[PDB]
Amino acid sequence: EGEYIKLKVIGQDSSEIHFKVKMTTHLKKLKESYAQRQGVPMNSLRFLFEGQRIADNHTPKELGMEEEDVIEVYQEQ
């Protein structure tokens, strides 16, 4: 059984919510949870890893993510 990695999601206001995900988890789930907790529609936000857009069906494995990596959230363009 694989382990959770813990990712830090940084908001435009520098707030942080951390999420534990497995390496094969689709990141849509993280995006939806984050948007829910911010009180905004998921499609109003864009989520970036090292500046690149995170797709709904990206996984941490596909993105090469590791423990304590950062996701930045910006308003959708």
Partner: peptide, 16 residues
Amino acid sequence: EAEERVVVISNSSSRY
């Protein structure tokens, strides 16, 4: 000071 927030991201019985 914000506190730490960690969120974990993890039918025949139906009746409707």
